[PDB]
Write a protein that binds this ligand. Structure first.
Ligand SMILES: OC[C@H]1O[C@H](O[C@H]2[C@H](O)[C@@H](O)[C@@H](O)O[C@@H]2CO)[C@H](O)[C@@H](O)[C@@H]1O
Ligand SMILES: OC[C@H]1O[C@H](O)[C@H](O)[C@@H](O)[C@@H]1O
Ligand SMILES: OC[C@H]1O[C@H](O)[C@H](O)[C@@H](O)[C@@H]1O
Ligand SMILES: [Ca+2]
Ligand SMILES: [Ca+2]
Ligand SMILES: [Ca+2]
Ligand SMILES: [Ca+2]
Ligand SMILES: [Ca+2]
Ligand SMILES: [Ca+2]
Ligand SMILES: [Ca+2]
Ligand SMILES: [Ca+2]
Ligand SMILES: [Ca+2]
Lengths: 150, 151, 151
């Protein structure tokens, strides 16, 4: 009887593994990107930093925070796809000139475009990623593509 | 020993599925879904007249948003606020004027009518819309409102 | 009997996961997807020329919509009707004019050509589009059509 039940359970699990794998592909198309254990997903629209940040946190995640070249490339795919620069999670709002993650830790990876960050006009504390994958500090009030990570 | 080994194996596979699925649930609901209790509201993102909206939800295996508690109503309101578009609820008093029911015919177990509503304005309001402030108003079924289904 | 209870526990978890997964699958398909058999069609919601559309589907781990039966075609038609935009199918006759094949080079096992099609108009129609009425027409691969992938 146990052997009978174990077999039924094995089949149920195998079915779920197959169904789940197909479902993951469906979910990620066309607004998501999986890289490592991280998943980037764009909302498809633009918002200023504070609004974008709240949407991500309320959804149980946070604004895109690429921590490696591999993550940045995955994120860049969505930006290129929507042809819209996106906001990253990092800012130097606390200490001008020092960009940090929402936790408060210092950047462990960066991909600044030449000359950036430059605090243009003395008011750029947020970061945007261009279609070429490079970063630029930009005013938090501007509207950029919303991309969260989970 | 084999059965034991088999069981332990299944344990690890199930743990992987649960963790992987837990992540995908969050990804899926962003930005058009809202989970509340065991119910999930999902907006189509566009507006349609009542009959069209209702068919979309039913064919999808669900039904139009039917908040049955203040918590469910507040969750649905979040989507309405996000899209900034009032949405249709599933309930109507099409059978018996003044008596609103769910698609199953059951009487309402919760309501959040704006003051003075429902008022059957113009003698022709049998459907219900929820505003960005979460309050309800009976409205003509021919009007176009945000489509939100529950699953 | 410790394995009996362990198996009992694991199954409850598995069945709860099955229920949650089923609910999330319905949510996922609303309103841009359609399930038919073991196949799932999902539209990106925008249009693109054939080559770009084909790349999007393959990079996503799938391929362009390839209806292989009347049932599959009807499901795909639902999405085309909903978006009110004709979509590209995966099949082409680029290798041998007049002979349409799936990306694998295999010959069609089902077709739903509109009357008079395929006609290779202008001597340059090697791709296929499906209309809101479900019928097919060969069309120039450079045209932009709704992107629908199958998984
Ligand atoms: O454009 C290629 C397409 O042309 C014809 O279809 C026309 C149709 O005749 C017009 O009435 C209108 O619907 O525009 C269509 C697209 O131009 C051919 O019938 C068709 O075979 C061909 O692919
Ligand atoms: O307008 C704001 C932007 O202008 C230019 O692109 C500058 O190179 C950049 O640093 C700045 O953020
Ligand atoms: O125009 C229709 C609506 O007009 C106003 O909002 C009334 O307060 C409301 O009761 C009615 O349904
Ligand atoms: Ca500053
Ligand atoms: Ca700054
Ligand atoms: Ca700058
Ligand atoms: Ca009436
Ligand atoms: Ca009425
Ligand atoms: Ca009213
Ligand atoms: Ca040809
Ligand atoms: Ca041809
Ligand atoms: Ca033709």
């Amino acid at each position: 009887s146990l052997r009978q039940q174990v077999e039924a359970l094995q089949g149920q699990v195998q079915h779920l593994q197959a169904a789940f794998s197909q479902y993951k592909k469906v979910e990620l198309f066309p607004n998501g990107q999986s890289v490592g254990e991280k998943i980037f997903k764009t909302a498809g629209f633009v918002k200023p930093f504070t609004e974008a940040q709240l949407l991500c946190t309320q959804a149980g995640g946070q604004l895109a925070s690429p921590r490696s070249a591999a993550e940045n490339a995955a994120l860049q795919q969505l930006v290129v796809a929507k042809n819209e620069a996106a906001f990253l999670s990092m800012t130097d709002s606390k200490t001008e000139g020092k960009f940090t993650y929402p936790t408060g830790e210092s950047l462990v990876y960066s991909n600044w475009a030449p000359g950036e960050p430059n605090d243009d006009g003395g008011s750029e504390d947020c970061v945007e990623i261009f279609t070429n994958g490079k970063w630029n500090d930009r005013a938090c009030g501007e509207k950029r593509l919303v991309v969260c990570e989970f």
